[PDB]
Enzyme design. Structure first.
Site: not given
Lengths: 652, 652
Positions: A197, A243, A287
């Site tokens: 990873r 994930h 946002y």
């Protein structure tokens, strides 16, 4: 007494011989260890894990000590106070053996004879649960798994990774119950997914968080030509499918592939506030908005035409790409860094692609001629590299420090005064942080002649850091001194590590390019094989509908008489000698397919389709024609995405 | 100088008159404000927002002060130092006006004449962006929106909420550019979504995070009869589709609907470690697993039969339930609390349902007879309530404190000694935290006679907190003193607030039940209307296939001659007088539908279907028959989910 009221889970039995104490990680298994246990004789100290980070007597350790009895050389006694067994219980993964090491190491230092008496055990949770139905399985090591699987009378492979995966009564029965349990005594002193990873894949140059982000954007059809979607939409998708960690880790990665200054060829196209060079953060994911870039489509082209192997996601309910087709040299193009052990700088798409094409023409080309194409790294942030010596070693051994220097000019400013003007800085350099250091030097007297210092840097004016020099002062000198003692010059430490054939290798330039081109050959070939195979299947269907349509009268007829869909089926295969598939396609044909102009749509489709099959075999038949394909396609990517170099490599 | 190197974004112009300084929230708009601005004359102080939480001279404020000039009564001068304009720039939402208030209030205190001179402006970002295509819109208040929309020559409604939603050049052009901008001068001193997103809905008793969690589990088909899925799968789904905030907020909510001790009727069925009463946390979401409970299916039954109105999710790309059909009284059953202004205790499903049925029989039943059914709250955590006085006021006014007391007995223990034994505690009481307080009292001398104190509490033995009393000591006394000075007795403060008709009301018991039963009437009626309408539509199709099948010869015939799918269509409507829909259903029929036993499947389907239409109209025709339905269905929920009461309400 030795009780820790509210942090220890006290046990009713009072003689040490009988009693055992589990050291378990709080958030990991605390609550579940506390319920499952036998509170007649079992005690639980759930340790805070974040306080047990990287003195060694901390509020938590203080509890361990006051819970047992004993102490150090000051009051030693093993014959003192309770728990004749101490059981270390932690997760299988990275943050859980991290604690196991820390608990062992400690013991060794302050509690030496706890081990000598062998009161310390490690616990042995199950390791695998195998499934079919009412027949699930608890196994404790790999060798037991060959044993019980190769056995199953009528004929799901799940690895246990955290203790919190387990219910209490399961934790009890498997891990703690004096009866079934089975622990471990300790005797000696104090690597995989951490790496898996972390490093990029040489092939598409991505790490797992990135691949999954890019994959998800594709799976969600967030293409460049459809509107933005709020980032929360990508992050949540990735979090839950691929994930299973904080959104924060995912968003950060996504944000970074969207920054002009971080990525030489940005992979995400974001709208809103995505932070800055000074290290301002992106605004809330609910946002900011985001989508794929045109270039990223290239990272994903053909992903559905069986060109990469897909693998199970983390719970086996989804499928994800082990790699992307990546039809431009991404590893090298956008580079790879992170926090910890790889470091590869970005490069010019044009250069790279030529650099690839020149290999694809002569297999034994040495870094030498390769470098005639790839002059060096090319940073998004522009600026200056200092020589070809740093570059050459890094391309040859895969290691070399490159000297990055900002772009600075000295300008007059009338009345005989001067000015330093910083237009661009070195890559990854926190501009704000540098400004604060240049200034700090002025404060202390460490540097002399700065009268002012401004960061005018704005969108419409790009980077502008402006250093004002006094009358009584030379600036050309002040400038060199700035390099000497500020990030204004920064070294890039090259360390070309990456996943080759699953395991991490340290590659040199050429080796990096070779592994890429072989993956493009693999990818265009597999594609071709899929197209072929998908074309033949469809033509075998069209063969069938034609037969069906030319004889519709008869087709309808046998169907109408046939009692069930099944006899219909075999009655179609006997009468029209259709294959199982053609028979079913026919049965599933809709009456609207019977109109006039449709028969011709079919013939015309079969006819072009036969040609397609033709040229596809023509490709697979000859490996050179297939390699030209790889060159052609790469040439086009180059023409449509190649850009001018931004970073000047000077010499002497 | 007044420069703050690295925290301020300096501007090149040096005369105050010209210069303006934006106070913007860091994570919100910092980076984007810094790029978009005119660094000839605009300065940016991006303020840390989490340090500006709830002295008032903090490291951030210290910067504001040193950036302007001035100070207080010690060096006051408005004619001192730069920025003749200070522009407060914050988000529209809760955490962004929170800062705006704090920045104003401060100014008023230390910088009084900044306002008197009127150097302080608030900024006015756009408020709406309207879409069709290449014709998007920037508007600044509601009244402008009527204006420009009612105008659009050829004929997407999106509210701007955060500054980070905006690109730089957009922030520049709309919000900061002296030209287009338009700010605001301040003159006076220092509510919606905070509430919307906080109170339950009287109808299904859920808050938004919960509804979306439960909805998502349904949308993902995570039913009780299919295996667990890792919680990360629910959390990510909800995060990205409906709740664009940290996973942490979502997971916490989900965890809590899965705790035996938090929920009287748990909504999520989790596997693994979901924390404890002592307040241990659940393990990582990628480790714990979860699914719907059988009971929750009841919260969601019929959600697809058009019984509740769906609304747009937060970006308009999804649809979510404004409420759930909730076919058992959830608000009252599992209650509602949280952190901040509502508080409603849990209750017995059996009691509640009867309590409902007794209303459904007589509209003007008073709390009196209602209470004959609903004796009081019933906590998951069991224990004792003290009287009917607390309960009565809370049912009548919707406010009353209930006294919860643990379950404790005094047992002998031979040799003349005694023991206090706590079997169950009051609701929501952190057991660990109580243990630590009881103990603390012993430490200080505040209570006398505790010789030991153990929390034996385990799964196999339930709650067991064990207090040992000395020989020379009365325990019955020690017990009452424990109530007096420890959570061992705790009051439940009833405050029955909830969303009625969108706005928050304070309801009493009866009013709560009335609003529920009306929603069940609504829900069973709407269902019935949907079934009817869906049945008629299908029968209108079956009408058509029959016609089609009886005359297949002819059907095929006209189709075969018809040049395009379109003429086919009209050629079917002219010849068989089918409706547009029947004609299309026919055209889309597959040849396999022509087999022997299929025609009969069709007749038989139409025939039962005609009866269905029958009994459905029979329901809608008569409101009593429809109410009996609501009673019947509620009676069954009751029988299959009703359980014994856990909490004893004693009297005197």
């Amino acid at each position: 007494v030795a009780s820790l009221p509210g942090k220890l889970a006290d046990c009713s039995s009072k003689s040490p011989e009988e009693c055992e104490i589990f050291l378990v990680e709080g958030d990991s298994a605390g609550g579940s260890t506390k319920s499952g246990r036998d509170s007649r004789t079992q005690a639980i100290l759930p340790l805070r894990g974040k306080i047990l980070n990287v003195i060694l007597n901390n509020n938590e350790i203080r509890q361990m000590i006051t819970a047992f009895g004993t102490g150090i050389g000051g009051d030693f006694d093993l014959a003192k106070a309770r728990y004749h067994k101490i059981v270390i219980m932690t997760d299988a993964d990275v943050d859980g053996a991290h604690i196991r090491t820390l608990l062992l190491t400690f013991f060794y230092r302050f509690m030496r004879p706890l081990i000598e008496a062998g009161y310390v055990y490690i616990a042995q949770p199950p390791l695998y649960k195998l499934t079919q139905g009412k027949q699930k399985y608890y196994v404790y090591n790999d060798r037991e798994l060959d044993k019980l699987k190769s056995e199953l009378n009528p004929t799901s492979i799940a690895r246990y990774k955290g203790l919190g995966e387990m219910n209490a009564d399961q934790l009890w029965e498997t891990t703690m119950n004096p009866e079934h349990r089975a622990l471990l005594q300790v005797k000696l002193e104090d690597m995989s997914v951490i790496v898996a990873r972390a490093l990029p894949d040489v092939r598409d140059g991505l790490k797992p968080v990135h691949r999954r982000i890019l994959y998800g954007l594709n799976e969600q059809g967030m293409t460049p030509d459809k509107s933005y979607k709020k980032s929360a939409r990508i992050v949540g998708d990735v979090m839950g499918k691929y994930h299973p960690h904080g959104d924060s880790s995912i968003y950060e990665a996504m944000v970074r592939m969207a920054q002009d200054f971080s990525y030489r060829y940005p992979l995400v196209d974001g709208q809103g506030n995505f932070g800055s060079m000074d290290g301002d953060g992106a605004a809330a994911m609910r946002y900011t908005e985001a989508r794929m870039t045109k270039i990223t489509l290239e990272l994903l082209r053909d992903i559905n035409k069986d060109t990469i192997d897909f693998i199970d996601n983390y719970d086996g309910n989804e499928r994800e790409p082990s790699v992307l087709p990546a039809r431009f040299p991404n590893l090298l193009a956008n580079g790879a860094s992170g926090i910890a052990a790889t470091n590869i700088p970005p490069h010019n798409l044009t250069e790279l692609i030529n650099g690839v094409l020149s290999l694809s023409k002569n297999p034994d080309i040495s870094i030498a001629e390769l470098m005639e194409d790839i002059e060096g790294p090319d940073f998004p942030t522009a600026g200056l590299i200092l020589g070809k010596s740093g570059i050459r070693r890094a391309y040859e051994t895969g290691r070399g420090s490159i000297q990055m220097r900002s772009r600075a000019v000295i300008e007059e400013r009338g009345g005989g005064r001067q000015r330093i003007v910083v237009t661009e800085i070195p890559f990854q350099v926190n501009k704000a942080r540098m400004i604060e250091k240049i200034a700090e030097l002025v404060r202390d007297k460490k540097i002399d002649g700065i009268t002012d210092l401004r960061d005018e840097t704005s969108l419409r004016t790009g980077v502008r850091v402006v250093i004002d020099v006094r009358k009584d002062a030379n600036a050309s000198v002040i400038l060199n001194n700035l390099y000497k003692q500020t990030p204004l010059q920064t070294s890039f430490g090259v360390n070309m590590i990456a996943l080759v054939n699953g395991r991490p290798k340290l590659i040199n330039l050429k080796e990096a390019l070779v592994h890429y081109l072989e993956h493009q050959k693999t990818v265009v070939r597999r594609r071709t094989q899929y197209n072929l195979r998908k074309a033949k299947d469809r033509a075998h269907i069209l063969e069938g509908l034609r037969i069906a349509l030319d004889h519709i009268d008869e087709i309808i007829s046998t169907i109408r008489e046939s009692d069930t869909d099944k006899v219909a089926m075999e009655s179609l295969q006997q009468r029209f000698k259709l294959s199982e598939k053609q028979a079913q396609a026919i049965l599933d044909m809709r009456l609207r397919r019977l109109t006039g102009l449709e028969r011709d749509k079919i013939e015309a489709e079969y006819n072009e389709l036969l040609n397609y099959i033709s040229e596809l075999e023509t490709i697979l038949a000859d490996e050179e024609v297939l390699l030209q394909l790889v060159r052609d396609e790469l040439t086009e990517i180059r023409d449509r995405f190649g850009d001018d170099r931004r970073t000047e490599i000077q010499l002497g």
